[PDB]
Amino acid sequence: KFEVLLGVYTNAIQYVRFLETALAVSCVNTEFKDLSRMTDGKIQFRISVPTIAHGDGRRPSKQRTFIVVKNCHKHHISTEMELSMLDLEILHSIPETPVEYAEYVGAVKTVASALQFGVDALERGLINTVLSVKLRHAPPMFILQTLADPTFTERGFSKTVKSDLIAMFKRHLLEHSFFLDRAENMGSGFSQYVRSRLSEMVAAVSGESVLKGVSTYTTAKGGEPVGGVFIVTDNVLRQLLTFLGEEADNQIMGPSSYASFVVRGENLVTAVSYGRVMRTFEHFMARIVDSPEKAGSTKSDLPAVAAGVEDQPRVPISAAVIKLGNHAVAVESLQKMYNDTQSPY
């Protein structure tokens, strides 16, 4: 008569890489080897705005230029692992007899997995940091909708304009919130209503971004450059799959590595002597002294505005997408990392 150890199973941790998530559609990933040195970053836009001549005696507005400055923000990420000193001790000594060898291999396996956990925790940290940064600059919908409309700000922000905008805000708050809740009573207009709501969400966000012309993530099907990313929980993703029915493509095409930034060259001298390092010192020297006369052209600027984003080869990212209006938009669920780490979504 005996008792039987009839099964031994161990869970396996799947690697989660930032580039494989659909969320990475909404970012530009630069590999900058020594980030700790950069004290502060800076981006300066210069925009020229024209006016239209008028026959009235009206006083005219002169030539208009605006100078916009944006700055980097840094993030620190850290995790703690614990190792039993006995394991780190027996790892050095050679094995004497096969039981010592069995204990040695068990020890090195344990410590290796203890480090696997660490690298995995840091990757989940990267992805959570990007998601939180995106959440910090995402104003709510009922404020965005009437502000995207240029019809209500045509004459600028006086008193009465704002007194009416607050009314539109409170009204959209009372009416259009929890739309996927209202779909049940809305009934047969369910699909068209959800489509119009998602399309209002899409059109509300401004699309004027400097890197718009660069060849970012594309549809797996030829053409149709992907426009953006939805992030939803699993239940709402199921409801969206039901109402939208068929999905568009089921996979997309994205880059395989991050664009490297190297401080080599005379940027090294400008970093030794001075605090500043100039980006794209090749083109920036060429524009001033090498080719001072010629005026810039967008086609001549496009190879410059992508430092290393362009050269990379593309591979199929697995992510669910749809097509709405004229835009291919991926819909992505992350509520599998936050469940497994057992942190709130």
Binding site: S26, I43, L122, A138, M141, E208
Partner: protein, 79 residues
Amino acid sequence: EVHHEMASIDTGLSYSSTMTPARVAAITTDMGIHTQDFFSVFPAEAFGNQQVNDYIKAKVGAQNGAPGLCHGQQATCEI
């Protein structure tokens, strides 16, 4: 300790993301009539006569935990 650093820049100039509520899943505050205790808010304040103060404290119900909560998180009420 495993460390990492990151750097972020907003690319464009306007708002580039929109969050919005889609579906209510639960209502937590019980939407009750629990009134906030001013006596526990101000433990210094008191009337003149000591026994009058103590009798008012006895009749008003002034002062824990609650053993079991049928609805959920109680929401204070103010008058």
